[PDB]
């Protein structure tokens, strides 16, 4: 057994949607995709869920940031400061 880099997986890109300190994400994979995040406060408040059924989800993003992992697609990151004026 060797450390080959398999030609490997990739899940379709997400639909990013803005709200006030909140990411609505209409999402639509090919296969069951383990999504997960890390609210970068010292309060981690992570989430995990395999997604195979297309699902609009939500994420209470904080002031300092959140990150977002659409499958083995690379991890995203997001500034959600205010939007409530």
């Amino acid at each position: 057994p060797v450390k080959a880099k398999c030609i490997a997986t990739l899940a379709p890109e997400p639909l990013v949607e803005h709200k006030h300190r909140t990411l609505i994400l209409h999402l639509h994979p090919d296969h069951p995709t383990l999504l997960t995040t890390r609210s970068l406060g010292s309060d981690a408040n992570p989430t995990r869920q395999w997604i195979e059924r297309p699902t609009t989800v939500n994420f209470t993003v904080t002031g300092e940031g959140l990150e977002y992992t659409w499958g083995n697609h690379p991890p995203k990151r997001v500034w959600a400061q205010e939007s409530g004026e």
Partner: protein, 50 residues
């Protein structure tokens, strides 16, 4: 309620009916034979996947 139809020998005027429930909604999608009273988003807008 003013239309006759002189087919046969009798002249007959019908309605207007009082029960104006169009079972169709305002917005409708249609597919082959199955009709869906769906709030289709619009031409020109529909979100991908949706």
């Amino acid at each position: 309620g003013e239309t006759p139809a002189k087919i046969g020998d009798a002249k007959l005027i019908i309605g207007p009916l009082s029960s104006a429930w169009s079972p169709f909604d305002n917005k409708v999608v249609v597919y082959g034979h199955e009709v869906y009273n769906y709030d289709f988003p619009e031409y020109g807008t529909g979100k991908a996947g949706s």
